[PDB]
A paper describes a structure:
Glycinamide-[name]-transformylase T ([name]) is found only in some specific bacteria including Mtb and utilizes ATP-dependent ligation to catalyze the formylation of 5′-phosphoribosyl-glycinamide (GAR) in the third reaction of the de novo purine salvage pathway. According to the MtbPurT structure, the monomer of MtbPurT consists of a small lid domain and a large α/β domain. The B-domain forms a flexible lid and covers the active site for ATP binding.
The MtbPurT crystal diffracted at 2.79 Å resolution at the SSRF and belonged to a space group P3121. There were two MtbPurT molecules in the asymmetric unit. Therefore, the MtbPurT protein exists as a dimer in solution. The final structure of MtbPurT is well ordered, and electron densities for all residues were clearly interpretable, except in four parts (residues 111–113, 175–180, 189–198 and 205–215). In contrast to phBCCPPurT, loop 252–255 between β11 and β12 in MtbPurT shifted by 13.1 Å away from the cofactor binding site. This structural rearrangement in apo-MtbPurT represents an “open” conformation. As a result, the pocket of MtbPurT for the cofactor binding has a much broader opening with a width of 11.6 Å (distance between Ser182 and Asp251) than 7.3 Å (distance between Ser172 and Asp239) for phBCCPPurT. And MtbPurT recognizes ATPγS with a relatively low binding affinity, with the Kd value of 207.41 ± 8.02 μM. All four mutants (R131A, E217A, S218A and V220A) lost their ATP-binding capability, indicating essential roles for these residues in binding with ATP. In particular, loop 383–389 in MtbPurT is much shorter than that in EcPurT (loop 352–364) and shifted 5.7 Å away from the phosphate of the GAR substrate; thus, no hydrogen bonds with GAR were found.
Author numbering:
A (entry chain A): 27 to 110, 114 to 174, 181 to 188, 199 to 204, 212 to 352, 365 to 413
B (entry chain B): 27 to 111, 115 to 153, 169 to 174, 212 to 352, 365 to 413
The structure:
């Protein structure tokens, strides 16, 4: 059983450990020579993965049982070549293509599915912008298809590309991790507990699990998460990005790769997002049981700093090279778990 | 920060992962070419580890910050020289020597310390080869129990932590079965901590120690201690917040530890087809660790040890 990982960054390494515990040989592919998953993989490969010819030869020679796309820098055309009884793609070349095309994924979510999003318009003129502002009002979020905030410049109520978004009030950003595998009885679709996340003080990301939601908010979230994921199809672990304001839930995005916010799961769930995606790739049963509330801080290791960081109760750390590290804590409550993680991170950075 | 592992087998691999999560480069040393920790280590080394000359040159050239002895086939004479000259040993050489000398460890436990053991005699009943030959009186036993003792430094100096007792026994098809926690009476648990703590402090140094005991209601007997992660410790990979390997990674490096339990659990060490895993991972709260030339660990957790053992039985059965 041979799995091939397109991408060899930090989560590619943990996934590779996970897959090796379950008995699989892993090939780690990337562009440069010293990539993280190269060090512990069974076989390392260097190719400009953004090269449809060069990538496709590599896949034909090695001929892996499973082809896992863990990065965004990849030839989607090369992947559809391989799809077009020798290798299962997990995720599908469909999902890889849909989620790298930002325009097409929004239009898939809001138009084909009836998913609720923040009002958005794709323009291609100045005049197109002019209308939207008159129609939509302020503030707007003009973004290339950096992201400027058009916060200023209809007489009656009955009245390349650049993306315009109306701005909505938001309480929480939330990551819904959806897992699609096979069980001993066929297809499984599992939901993790909502993961709350946000940008923190020193340019770090903070996450925590579980984020509490109302019944109506949680029903909406499962519904939205489940529907975008079934449209993509195939086995895999999907991170579905949502915006929440009390009862309202908005679709923002989905990634076929383990999000930075998922790092909390390494300590807060029985099976981490990496153990889940190892099992999903290989078509094995999964559950989404939680160990305990937790929080994480992704920073972007002096001997003194480590000693101090691990002095914080129920804490853990994942050191990764230059400027990359994860601070982790668990606790009987999310609030304690976030305070401990901020302590771990503070003693570390 | 560079740790060197004497021994490169399956537990040496998990310890190596653990140490790499905490930021350390690991050198895996063993006798043969394809050893398990070689595959994911940062640097691999092949040497005859019982050769004091050959081993000692290897340690002098590489010059690691920490020297960890994970196997028993190692030159203790080569090891004592490293403590006499740049490099911290976890575990310490005193411990490596005492626990490989079976006669001297018994005499240390029963004579110098006043530890209770089964009556024993060395001559020159359970007659066993120790030359000398060891004679033991046979006592009634309820449970075999592993007491995992952890010695590290915290942010406030020395720590000595006890894990929850691990029960273990030989089960069917040659599998070793373990489970955590094993319930003990107050008097039994007081005895066990006392015995575990006393043999470990006599060895000294940082490390993770497995202390073997025999239990019959009230009475606790010392049977053995190892400076290496016992096969019965495998249950901790899922039953404790920090597995025996994460604890020994933290102990080697002198970091704080705790011994919190996630949930009751059980394990079965067997000594791997796709349908075997599909069927095996269908058991609730189950996990597997595949190695090896047939080596595998079946794991389950549950709200009760009894369910956790039945699930692990099932996982192992669907796997074997």
């Amino acid at each position: 059983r041979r799995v091939m990982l397109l991408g060899s960054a930090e989560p590619s390494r943990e996934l590779a450990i996970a897959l090796q515990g379950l008995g699989a040989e892993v090939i780690a592919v990337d562009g440069y020579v010293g990539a993280p998953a190269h060090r512990i993989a069974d076989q390392s490969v260097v190719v400009t993965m953004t090269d449809a010819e060069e990538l496709t030869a590599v896949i034909r020679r090695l001929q892996p049982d499973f082809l896992v796309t863990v990065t965004a820098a990849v030839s989607v055309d090369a992947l559809d070549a391989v799809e077009q009884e020798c290798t299962e793609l997990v995720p599908n070349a469909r999902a890889v293509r849909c989620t790298a095309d930002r325009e097409g994924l929004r239009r898939l979510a809001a138009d084909q599915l009836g998913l609720p999003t923040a009002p958005f318009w794709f323009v291609g003129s100045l005049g197109e912008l002019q209308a939207v502002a008159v129609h939509a009002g302020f503030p707007l979020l003009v973004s290339p298809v950096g992201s400027s905030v058009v916060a200023g410049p209809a007489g009656h109520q009955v009245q390349p590309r650049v993306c315009a978004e109306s701005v909505v009030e938001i309480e929480f950003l939330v990551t819904m991790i959806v897992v699609c595998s096979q069980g001993p009885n066929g297809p499984l679709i599992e939901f993790c507990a909502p993961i709350g996340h946000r940008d923190a003080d020193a340019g770090e990301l903070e996450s925590w699990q579980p984020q509490k939601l109302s019944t109506a908010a949680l029903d909406a979230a499962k519904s939205i998460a489940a529907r975008i994921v079934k449209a993509l199809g195939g086995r895999g672990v999907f991170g579905v990005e949502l915006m929440i304001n009390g009862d309202e839930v908005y679709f923002a995005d989905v990634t076929v790769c383990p999000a930075g916010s998922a790092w909390v799961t390494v300590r807060s769930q029985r099976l981490s997002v990496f153990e889940l995606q190892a099992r999903a790739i290989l078509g094995l049963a999964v559950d989404t049981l939680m160990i305990s509330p937790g929080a994480a801080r992704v920073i972007n290791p002096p001997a003194d700093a480590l000693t101090g960081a691990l002095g914080v109760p129920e804490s853990d750390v994942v050191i990764f090279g230059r400027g990359l590290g994860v601070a982790l804590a668990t606790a009987p409550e999310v609030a304690i778990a976030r305070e401990r993680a901020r302590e771990v991170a503070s003693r570390l950075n």
